[PDB]
Structures are given as C-alpha cells and as structure tokens.
Write a protein that binds this ligand. Structure first.
Ligand SMILES: Nc1nc2c(ncn2[C@@H]2O[C@H](COP(=O)(O)O)[C@@H](O)[C@H]2O)c(=O)[nH]1
Ligand SMILES: Nc1nc2c(ncn2[C@@H]2O[C@H](COP(=O)(O)O)[C@@H](O)[C@H]2O)c(=O)[nH]1
Ligand SMILES: [Cl-]
Ligand SMILES: [Cl-]
Ligand SMILES: [Cl-]
Ligand SMILES: [Mg+2]
Ligand SMILES: [Mg+2]
Ligand SMILES: [Mg+2]
Lengths: 308, 313
C-alpha cells in the first residue's frame, strides 16, 4: 500500500497531458458513464471568464468532457455574473448557496458551497482569471482519474513562460510540506487552482475558507485516500501573475498546517495572542508603520454531514 | 507587540554619529564590526572604505572584521588591501571542520571579535551608507536596558521585507512568536548586541541563523530589551526563487527545532509515516522544466553550534 517515498510516487504518478488526448478521454468517460462539473470560483473576472467558458465549449465539441460549468461569483461589481451567463455558463452567488451559514468567507467557502450545486460524478476546480486559456487546462487533470484505476485526486502542474511555482508556493507551501508533510513534497504546483476529484471525496472532507483552502484540501485528501491515489499532470506553459497581499496568503497557508498539526497532536500548546490578528510591519517613506489585518479562519465540515 | 513597536522603533536621524562617538567614549565601550563575506570582491572594498570614512568623522568602530568563505573571487585579498582584518571561516574554530554556511561563519567570528559590542554587517551591499553601520548602535548606547538592536529599512510602497521575510518569517512569527511581529526586517543582516550575549546562545548554521538568533535572544533578554532602527533605503540583492526555497526551509527548520525544544511540537514525524519519507536534511524541490517535470533534491544537515563560551578557550 502506497509508494515507498516521494521519489517513487513522483515517477509513478506524474503525467504529461500529451498522454491523454481529449478524444480518448471522452471515450473512456463515456464508457464509464461518468459526468464532470467544472467549477470556476469567480471574483471580478469579467474580461477572462467569457473566453474560458468559450474554450470549454469548443473542447466539448471536439471531445465531450465537461457536462456542467459553474461560475460561483463573489457578487462582482464588474458584471462577471452577466458575462458568464451570456456565454452559456450557470451562475451562482457564493452568498446565496448554503445561505444559512451567512455571507461567504472568501475563496474556500465559495468552493465548498459549490458542492451543493455540482451534479457531476467528478468535480474539477478551475481558476477563472486565466488570461490565455488552453484546452488542456480543463482536460489534462482528468487523464489519470479516467485512465488509471486507483487515482482519485489529480493536481495540475505547469511552468511560467525551471519553475517551482509562485512565491507563496516556493516560500511557504513547499518548505512547510517538506517538513510536516513529506508525502506532498513531490507536487510541482501544490496550490494550483486546477485539480479534480470525485464529488464523494470532496463531500467527505472539511473545507478551510479563504486562502487556506488549497492547502487544506491537499492535507485532507492525503489523509483520506492515501498518497498513492493522488497524481499530477504537466499542462505545459501557463502565464500566471503584490508581495503585500501575498503575506496574508502565506499566513493562511501557515494557519492551515498549524491547525492540522494541532488536530494530529503534533502541535500541542501553541495578550499579544490572537490567530486571526496578523501584524504586518513595514517601512514607508513616512517612517515605520505597523499595519494590522484580521481574517477569520473557518473550517466548514464535510458537506456530507449537512446534505442528504 | 504594539506597545513594543511604539516604544522601541527609532529613526537613525535620532543618533547623529558624533553624539554616539561621544557617548561611546564616555561609556568606554568598544565596537567590533563583523562582515561575513562570500564572493563579495566587488563590494567589501567600498564598505570598508565608508567605515574608515565614518571613523574619521566619528570614532565608532574599533575593529573591522571580514570573515571570508574562502571566496574564489578574491574577496579576502580585497578586504585585506582595504585595511580590514581578514580571517577564513575555515581557520576559525577549525576543530569543527569546514564551516557550514553563513551561520557558522558568524558563530566562528566571535572567537576573534575583540569588542564589547558586536555589530554584524552584510558585505554584499552594492551601495553602502554610513548609517548602515551606526544606526543600530543608537539604542544600545543611549536607551537603558536595550541589549539587542535590529536594522529596519526599505527598498528603493510599503516594504515589508524580502520574499523570505514576507512569506516565511513573518507568517511563522505571527503564529508561533507573536512578540517578533513588530520587526520590519526580522532577518536583517545588520544588528548589534553585547559580545557576552552572542557568546551565550547557540547559533544555527547556514541560513537558519538569523531566525535562531531572533528567537534565542527574545527568550534570553526579553522583548523590552530589543529594538529597531529605520536606516532609510537599502538596495537588496535579487536572488533566484529556487535558492530562496532552500532558505525558507532553513527558516522553517529553525522555528520547528525551537518549537520542539519548547515542547510545543510533540512529534515531528507523523505517526504512520514510513521512515523512508522522513529525512529533514533532504529537501525535495519539485519543478517544471522545458523538458518535463523533475524532482530536484538538496541535502543540507541543520548543524547547530553550542554557545561559544562552552567551547572557546
Ligand atoms: N467566488 C469567489 N472566487 C474567488 C475569491 N477569491 C478569488 N477567487 C477566484 O478564484 C480564482 C483564483 O483565486 P486567486 O487565489 O488567484 O485570487 C480566480 O478565478 C478568482 O477570481 C472569492 O473570495 N470568492
Ligand atoms: N563567511 C561567509 N559569509 C557568507 C556565507 N554565505 C553568505 N555570506 C555572506 O553573508 C552576508 C549575507 O548574504 P546572504 O545571506 O543574503 O546570502 C553577505 O555578506 C554574504 O556574502 C558563507 O557561507 N560564509
Ligand atoms: Cl479564528
Ligand atoms: Cl530539527
Ligand atoms: Cl539535520
Ligand atoms: Mg491566481
Ligand atoms: Mg543578501
Ligand atoms: Mg525530506
């Protein structure tokens, strides 16, 4: 059971999207009767969503792969909802889904809530701010779930135009994974927005809200199904894109690990103390300034325990 | 945290060099500047010159100490030719073998620093101004109880430090060491404390050193005895995000190590985890390249040095 090392896993569970031609995936998907829901957490992305939806439609014409497109909007003031709707996608407000829990706590919350309107056997999350969307950003990661029995969770891998990820990935995720979760060290883009798993899986794990979500899922999936059931697919080049705001992103990652460490018993007994209170000291032309942020880390339970 | 920030942050304008010099003579204290050097042939010269220039205006630094990493670029010769005392990191405490990175050089520097105060200064600084030397001296000389002063600065707009400071150090500190969240440049190379303080704490070697020092000094003298000085502008050397990854790991390992000593970290290895997955010195850096995916693998033992007092003659 399981690979013997991060090295063995890396050889056995890393793929190239060229291995999964779309029309071949479409056939297997059909033979298995599986359906796929693509979820696009959207927040002020009116200029890029249309194109992405369009590309998914064109792909489907060549190879029927995506059955449902969900734009879970953050009630964007730039008319995202409209653009998405007119381009043929289903559109939901992150605030109206599971509205008993109140307004949405950031990206993680919106992604968890999406599970209540996802109908597909498989659930594929996809960033919606992507400037130049290429077909394999949608189908690449489907490859191993459809083609390799045993694989339940697939993460995208990619490079900017030798790439080990963006700053938060390089400087927060991987160092923390290498130390506390060695099994995840082989992932090239552990925090990638594009990934897929069966809906059952997503419904059986908790979801951290805000920017903790990606880290949380990585840990929780690992615990749930085993490293052997996770994989990654090189998707070629993709163009990605303020060090200040990243600071809070990195904090969310640290909080996620910390929280999981608390629960495992690895982290015991963790005034000037308040976890959601992040002191960010900075140097400005007008002297030193100590700015202060507050973001609530909320864990939503497996949607399993709420629905059905 | 906040009460500290108000009461312990200073501007270098508050400490004119001539006042400090006068205060230093009054107090009878000597200062040793230590410059860990690794392939900085193009910059040490200027720094050593500036410090000599400063001394002429205001006698502040008594010993200029370049501790070289046997730099292939001839750094040691440059430093010598400019008037500095040069030592090889490998000849200091040579009973410990060759030096394991920057932390080791800094620890080893203590064995030959002669001053009551020890001012660490970075040697890669492409444009060096006088206050990068005297700024941090302000509080240790003029504010009672202050034993340790760290530099603060901005890049030529709310600079919260380099990539490692913003995305590794500060997030970790905010969670595990709230008291240090006030520091703008926690991992700054410019800082100063009395020689007896440095000689009485462990030093993590390599790139874990700045973090180790901040945690250890905190524990030892208390937040109240630490301060920071805004030194204005300082160009930072740009490095590859690949190499910074290794550095962030050093930071994480320092914090993890200390959490373990505090008992706040019970198990490091998660129960269930096969042994083959457990190797802290082994850092896996998964990357995408033009010719496919690859699993780069760096090995670097986290070597720690005992307080030099217990080992130095
Ligand atoms: N529904 C929703 N989407 C978000 C939120 N924050 C970011 N997103 C979206 O999720 C994707 C990736 O988010 P990122 O981490 O790059 O900001 C983008 O499509 C983006 O607009 C949010 O708070 N709510
Ligand atoms: N003696 C010595 N100095 C080093 C070493 N690594 C870095 N340094 C120096 O320490 C200072 C900090 O540079 P950095 O930490 O940004 O690489 C620079 O002056 C630099 O050249 C080392 O391994 N040995
Ligand atoms: Cl909280
Ligand atoms: Cl350790
Ligand atoms: Cl080690
Ligand atoms: Mg993004
Ligand atoms: Mg540097
Ligand atoms: Mg390892």
């Amino acid at each position: 059971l399981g690979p013997a090392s991060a090295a063995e896993w890396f050889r056995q569970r890393s793929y190239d999207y060229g291995q999964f031609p779309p029309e071949d995936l479409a056939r297997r998907k059909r033979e298995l009767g599986l359906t796929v829901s693509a979820v696009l957490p959207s927040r002020n992305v009116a200029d890029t969503v249309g194109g992405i939806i369009d590309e998914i439609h064109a792909l489907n014409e060549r190879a029927p792969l995506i059955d449902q497109i969900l734009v879970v909007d953050a009630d964007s003031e730039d008319g995202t909802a409209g653009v998405a709707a007119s381009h043929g996608a289903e559109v939901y407000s992150e605030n109206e889904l599971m509205s008993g829990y109140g307004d949405a706590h950031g990206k993680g919350d919106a992604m968890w809530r999406a599970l209540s309107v996802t109908r597909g056997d498989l659930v594929l999350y996809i960033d919606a701010d992507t400037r130049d969307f290429r077909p394999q950003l949608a189908y690449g990661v489907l490859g191993p779930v459809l083609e390799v029995p045993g694989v339940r969770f697939v993460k995208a891998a990619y490079r900017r135009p030798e790439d080990g990820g963006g700053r938060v990935t390089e400087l927060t995720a991987k160092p923390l994974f290498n130390l506390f979760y060695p099994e995840l060290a082989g992932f090239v883009q552990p925090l990638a927005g594009e990934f897929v798993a069966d809906r059952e899986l997503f419904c059986s794990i908790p979801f951290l809200t805000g920017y903790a979500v990606e880290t949380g899922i990585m840990i929780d999936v690992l615990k749930k199904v085993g490293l052997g059931a996770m994989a990654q697919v090189d998707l070629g080049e993709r163009q990605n894109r303020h060090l200040r705001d990243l600071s809070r992103m990195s904090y969310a990652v640290v909080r996620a690990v910390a929280r999981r460490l608390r629960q495992e018993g690895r982290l015991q007994q963790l005034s000037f103390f308040q976890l959601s209170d992040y002191l960010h000291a900075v140097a400005t032309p007008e002297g030193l300034k100590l700015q202060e942020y507050v973001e609530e880390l909320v864990e939503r339970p497996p949607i399993n325990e709420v629905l059905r």
